[PDB]
Design a protein around this ligand. Structure first.
Ligand SMILES: [Hg+2]
Ligand SMILES: [Hg+2]
Ligand SMILES: [Hg+2]
Ligand SMILES: [Mg+2]
Length: 306
């Protein structure tokens, strides 16, 4: 595989939430801590950003509605209307606050399932690794624009993916240092039968799982925060490590397939220095990377349907 640093993009405090819109060949992503959204159009070398005054953790185009995006603003799920280039949104319309009385929580990773439903989970704003408060839950946003809860006691609500046959959902609580698998019922949007798919400790994989995505062959690509890598793992059988790709930045946070043929992997990372880092500060930068030559394709990002 070839790993390239995307020079055009600079350094992010906590780059996260990459989303590839295939119809416009555009990558969107966030910096959680700096309260900014980012847009990159690789074919034209265009980069823009947009500032808000709440912590943000994902940005997904709204189905059927050009120029509108579903985003997180601390604990609110909101529709942002944005021209893709001005430094502030045109307007913000809140949809729902998922946890109105839990003042010290925030939303973290979120993604649409293959049907267009937004799934996303919460966590303490001061969550910590490897130990910290455990106050998060996992939700989806339903038809009556109210949330349904699917899991609780989550420390660090992170990456989501769904199997290509819509039978399984994969989920990461970074605090557990493992990837879980659930049976997923597409009819009722219910998950059940939680079991560990991949346990870091059994494979001497350092760091913590963070974001993840799935490829056309059904394998998972998982970002390893404080592991300086992405790993490829099987979904056909538990506890199988298929490949490792080293990424120069130690704090890799998430991954999305993109490019015209959906065979380039975009990788975000975090430059924020944490206490108890296993890496010296000079190494922790927060660049965005592109990985090519993996031999597989993924899928385009799914828009949220409301
Ligand atoms: Hg923006
Ligand atoms: Hg924006
Ligand atoms: Hg904006
Ligand atoms: Mg994450």
């Amino acid at each position: 595989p070839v790993v390239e640093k995307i020079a055009e993009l600079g350094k992010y405090t906590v780059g996260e939430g990459p989303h590839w819109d295939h119809e416009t060949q555009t990558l969107y992503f966030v910096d959680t801590v700096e309260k900014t959204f980012h847009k990159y159009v690789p074919s034209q070398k265009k980069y823009t950003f947009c500032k808000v005054d709440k912590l943000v953790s994902f940005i997904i185009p709204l189905a059927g509605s050009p120029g509108r995006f579903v985003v997180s603003l601390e604990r609110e799920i909101a529709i942002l209307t944005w021209d893709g280039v001005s430094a502030a949104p045109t307007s913000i319309e809140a949809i729902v606050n998922v946890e109105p009385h839990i003042k010290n929580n925030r939303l973290n990773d979120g993604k649409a399932d293959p049907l267009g439903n937004l799934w996303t989970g919460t966590m303490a704003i001061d969550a910590g690794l490897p130990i910290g408060p455990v106050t998060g839950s996992l939700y989806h946003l339903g038809a009556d624009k109210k949330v349904k809860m699917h899991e609780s006691n989550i420390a660090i609500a992170n990456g989501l993916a769904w199997s290509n046959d819509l039978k399984k959902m994969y989920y990461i609580d970074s605090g557990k240092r493992r990837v879980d698998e659930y049976d997923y019922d597409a009819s009722t949007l219910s998950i059940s039968n939680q079991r560990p798919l991949f346990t870091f400790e059994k494979h001497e994989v350092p760091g913590y799982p963070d974001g993840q995505t799935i490829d056309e062959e059904g394998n998972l690509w998982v970002a390893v925060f404080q592991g300086q890598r992405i790993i490829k793992i099987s979904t056909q059988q538990p506890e199988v490590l298929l490949d490792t790709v080293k990424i120069p930045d130690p704090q890799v946070t998430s991954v999305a397939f993109g490019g015209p043929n959906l065979d380039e992997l975009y990788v975000t990372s975090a430059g924020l220095q944490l206490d108890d880092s296993s890496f010296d500060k000079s190494l922790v930068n927060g660049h965005v990377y592109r990985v090519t030559g993996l031999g597989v394709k993924g899928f385009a990002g799914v828009k949220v349907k409301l």
